[PDB]
Amino acid sequence: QIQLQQSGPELVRPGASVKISCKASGYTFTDYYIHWVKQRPGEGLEWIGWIYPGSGNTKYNEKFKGKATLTVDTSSSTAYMQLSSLTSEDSAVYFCARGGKFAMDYWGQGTSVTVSSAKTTAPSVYPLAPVCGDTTGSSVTLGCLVKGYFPEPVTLTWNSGSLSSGVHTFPAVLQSDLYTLSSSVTVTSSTWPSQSITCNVAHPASSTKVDKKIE
Amino acid sequence: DVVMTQTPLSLPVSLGDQASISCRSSQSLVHSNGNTYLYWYLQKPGQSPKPLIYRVSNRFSGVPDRFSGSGSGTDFTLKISRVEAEDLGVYFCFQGTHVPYTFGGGTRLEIKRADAAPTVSIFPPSSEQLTSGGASVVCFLNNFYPKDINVKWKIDGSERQNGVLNSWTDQDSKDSTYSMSSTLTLTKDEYERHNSYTCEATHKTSTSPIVKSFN
């Protein structure tokens, strides 16, 4: 029944513009407001503004007027939001939501806009072996650092799939238009060095690396 | 803009517990028409917010009767009476009475757990990286509880602010602990300009900083 189904370009260069759509279904488009909201990950929600599809009237958040422009096409019951002159501060997930004038009830799924000047870049995968001597008790923790890649995602696997216990893959952070990810694997002291551990890293947008933690 | 403050910002709960979150506005949300436009939404870790309470106390349709909103003017309260695993996520209150509409900061409900001190492990740059020209020192602070940890890099006794990237895992599925990764990036002939690199962490479990270091 009621669905706001979003869709709108997601990797963009700074200074460009991106138009994100929100096709509504399961209810009469014309009777409700479409509200748009921005979320910068690890953070809260900001209300951008709304449109009334019946009249085409809008109200914007002072902060976003000029940046966001809101538009509806009542023949297809699809609403749009164009962001302009993008900067990094604009990389967030944007949501349209159906609502009445003052508040929204049912939200669309989100559209992630990532602003970066990068080209497709194969990662540099780096082995992170234990510092030296004066360390380990029952366990030794090894790590894989994979950096400078664009776009997301990568697959990091430890010994081609088994060695599921003890690993933590941290979420990738964008820093200076490329991403870095890292993974720890903790194993028992009679397992490493003796039994070799490799980290396997794959990047759909390019090709695969398999790196052994020696020493 | 009206400010909305939510309390707590993190609420550990054993399943089956009662739980209360609160939302305070910097001014009354009673509107001229008598209605108070205070809404509460739940964002579950990988998706869009879902509506729960409309105009201070009315539940939306399929919201379980366990949820209850209360409050007036500027102080409002959400309460969950017998929390369930499907209720874990972030809670936000929303005021639609004043333009621009504003959300509260969020309150994450999480599973209570015993305190666990972190496992800190520092990693010098790899031969591989230094040959390529860069130097990333990586510090992994694995498996602790509560989430509040404060980590700092001090290279040769100076606290370095610039160049560290941090990443956190969600609360662990079968463990309830947290993990963090902190990476410090320098250039080879810059890393070569100093020698002790320290990664000290402060956490509830220890009155002394947890210090890992090398030369």
CATH number at residue B182: 2.60.40.10
Cis peptide before A53 (omega within 30 of 0): no
Alpha-carbon span A147 to A167, nearest angstrom: 18
Q: Which of A45, A61, A173 sits opposite B167 (nearest CB)?
A: A173
Q: Single out the residue in B113, B141, B174 at which a domain terminates.
A: B113
Q: Single out the residue in B54, B80, B113 at which a domain terminates.
A: B113
Question: Residue A94 — φ and ψ, nearest 5°?
Answer: -110, 140
Alpha-carbon span B129 to A142, nearest angstrom: 16
Chain A residue numbers with beta carbons less than 8 Å from the beta carbon of B214 are: 131-132
Whose CA is closest to A20, among A108, A119, A88, A106? A108
Alpha-carbon span A201 to A181, nearest angstrom: 10
Do residues B46 and B136 share a domain? no
Alpha-carbon span A37 to A56, nearest angstrom: 18
Question: Residue B46 — φ and ψ, nearest 5°?
Answer: -105, 25
Do residues B174 and B160 share a domain? yes
Alpha-carbon span B101 to B95, nearest angstrom: 6
Do residues B98 and B198 share a domain? no
Q: Are B43 and B24 in contact (CB under 8 A)?
A: no
| Angstrom resolution of this structure | 2.8
Verify whether the Cβ–Cβ distance B214 to A132 is below 8 Å.
yes
Q: Cα dihedral sign for B103, B106, B109, B110? A: positive
Question: Residue B44 — φ and ψ, nearest 5°?
Answer: -100, 145
Residue at token pair 């009542």: A74
Q: Which residue range is the domain that position B136 belongs to?
A: 114-215
Question: Per the structure block, which two tokens stand in for A129?
Answer: 């072996």
Do residues B93 and B118 share a domain? no
Q: Are A96 and A6 in contact (CB under 8 A)?
A: yes
Alpha-carbon span A34 to A100, nearest angstrom: 8
* Chain A, chain B: beta-carbon pairs less than 8 Å apart: 121
Superfamily for domain range A1-117: Immunoglobulins (2.60.40.10)
Chain B residue numbers with beta carbons less than 8 Å from the beta carbon of A47 are: 100-103
Alpha-carbon span B116 to B95, nearest angstrom: 38
Verify whether the Cβ–Cβ distance B48 to A95 is below 8 Å.
yes
Task: Confirm or reject contact between A44 and chain B (CB < 8 A).
Answer: yes
**Max CA separation in chain A (angstroms):** 73
Q: Which of B54, B96, B129 sits opposite A126 (nearest CB)?
A: B129
Verify whether the Cβ–Cβ distance B140 to A141 is below 8 Å.
yes
Question: Residue B168: closest CA among chain A residues belongs to which residue?
Answer: A170
The count of other CB atoms within 10 Å of the CB of residue B107 is 22
Method: X-ray
- Own/partner long-range contacts of B67-73 (Cβ < 8 Å, ≥24 apart): B69/B38, B69/B40, B71/B22, B71/B23, B71/B38, B72/B30, B72/B36, B73/B25, B73/B28, B73/B29, B73/B30, B73/B36
Question: Per the structure block, which two tokens stand in for A9?
Answer: 């370009």
A178-188 β-sheet, strand order: A124-128, A139-149, A178-188, A167-175
Do residues B108 and B138 share a domain? no
Do residues B118 and B197 share a domain? yes
Task: Confirm or reject contact between A188 and chain B (CB < 8 A).
Answer: no
Could you please report the per-residue DSSP string of B176-212? --EEEEEEEEEEHHHHTT---EEEEEEETTEEEEEEE
Do residues B128 and B199 share a domain? yes
Could you please report the per-residue DSSP string of A42-69? TS-EEEEEEEETTTTEEEE-GGGBTTEE
Verify whether the Cβ–Cβ distance A180 to B183 is below 8 Å.
yes
Do residues B80 and B118 share a domain? no
Do residues B60 and B120 share a domain? no
Could you please report the per-residue DSSP string of B100-163? SPEE---EEEEE----B--EEEEEPPPHHHHHHTEEEEEEEEEEEBSS-EEEEEEETTEEE-TT
Do residues B6 and B17 share a domain? yes
Question: Residue A130 — φ and ψ, nearest 5°?
Answer: -55, 145
What fold characterizes domain A118-215? Immunoglobulin-like (2.60.40)
Residues of chain A with CATH 2.60.40.10: 1-117, 118-215
Task: Confirm or reject contact between A27 and chain B (CB < 8 A).
Answer: no
Q: Single out the residue in B58, B78, B113 at which a domain terminates.
A: B113
Could you please report the per-residue DSSP string of A171-202? EEEEETTEEEEEEEEEEETTTTTTS--EEEEE
Do residues B122 and B109 share a domain? no
Do residues B66 and B127 share a domain? no
H or E element in which residue A106 lies: strand A104-107
Alpha-carbon span A55 to A179, nearest angstrom: 43
Number of domains in chain B: 2
Partners of residue A149 on adjacent β-strands: A179
Q: Which of A45, A105, A180 sits opposite B165 (nearest CB)?
A: A180
From the CA of A43, how many Å to the nearest CA of chain B? 8
Q: Which of B48, B125, B180 sits opposite A108 (nearest CB)?
A: B48
